């Protein structure tokens, strides 16, 4: 009747798995984010240069005998060039996101 101390000890063990379990989440979190700045950096580099390329194909193209062909490639960069993007603001949307949890 009096043994609200059950209650007490139990409120006192979820309470310890609860804060061990809310940093793990931090960290893990943390962890991603830190992970998605690299994948990010890389890819950014990547597509930096990809980007140079693909233009010059174009730019060239006109003056090529194989014209033809170095449209085509030009596009086929420009295809994994948009995919990239992609990958890349998603990468962002996982910073920010994180880096807007450091902000509470």
Not at 4 to 29: K, T, W
Not at 54 to 69: D, G, I, P, V
Request: hydrophobic share 40%.
């Amino acid at each position: 009747a009096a043994s609200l101390v059950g209650e007490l000890q139990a409120a006192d063990a979820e309470y310890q798995n609860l804060a061990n379990q809310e940093e793990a989440r931090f960290n893990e979190e943390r962890a991603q984010a830190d992970a998605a700045r690299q994948a990010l950096a890389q890819n950014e580099q990547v597509y930096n240069e990809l980007s140079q390329r693909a233009q010059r194909l174009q730019a060239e193209a006109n003056t090529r005998f194989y014209k033809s062909q170095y449209q085509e490639l030009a596009s086929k960069y420009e295809d994994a060039l948009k995919k990239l993007e992609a990958e890349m603001e998603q990468q962002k949307a996982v910073i920010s996101d994180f880096e807007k949890i450091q902000a509470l």
